[PDB]
């Protein structure tokens, strides 16, 4: 549910 670092 967490935001990835692109």
């Amino acid at each position, epitope marked *: *549910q*967490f*935001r*990835h*670092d*692109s």
Partner: antibody
Amino acid sequence: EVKLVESGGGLVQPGGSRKLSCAASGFTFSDYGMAWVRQAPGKGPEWVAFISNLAYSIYYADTVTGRFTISRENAKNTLYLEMSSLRSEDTAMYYCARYDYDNILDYVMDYWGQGTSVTVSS
Amino acid sequence: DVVMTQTPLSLPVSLGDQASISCRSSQSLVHSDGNTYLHWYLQKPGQSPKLLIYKVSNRFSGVPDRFSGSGSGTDFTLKISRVEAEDLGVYFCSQSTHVPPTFGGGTKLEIKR
């Protein structure tokens, strides 16, 4: 193949501390968010903390926030959990776990280590 | 938090038979991106959980054909079509649609006699 190996468990007094490490191999470590998951005897797993792949996002379960600090160092392929003010209810197997992603969301913990045991007792 | 409710707590089965385990979430597991982030894990004695099925019905790498998952909204099922001795252990469902990710209480797969 993906490998995760945690260490730093042990027996500590209530109010003591721990710094767990998790060594990662077989994937580009800096491409993946990582988590800590703990499990007491007889219980299901319980998510503890999460850190995004470049460490812009960190989240904590309600049961640990304030006391634990998650961190990573991408150049050492290592994830960390500093734990303080430990209570007997923190006694558990502690697992390191990789989060997979296909786009912008870390959506599933797919590889888990064998765990490092932490006992908190007087 | 999202509460994951597994039934049965304990599941006796004959080898070669079919086992069915159900999971119920206390909220919809449809994420705003449209996926349903519901997963199943298998834990054997003295080992960590291993992922079996992710996003309702995708078999993880190396998971044999006899594991099948389905369901929608809040009601989910994992099928093991022909239980083998290596499948005995504790199965957990898990959701990753909402923070925090949560786990069911487990279902122990056990032998009938």
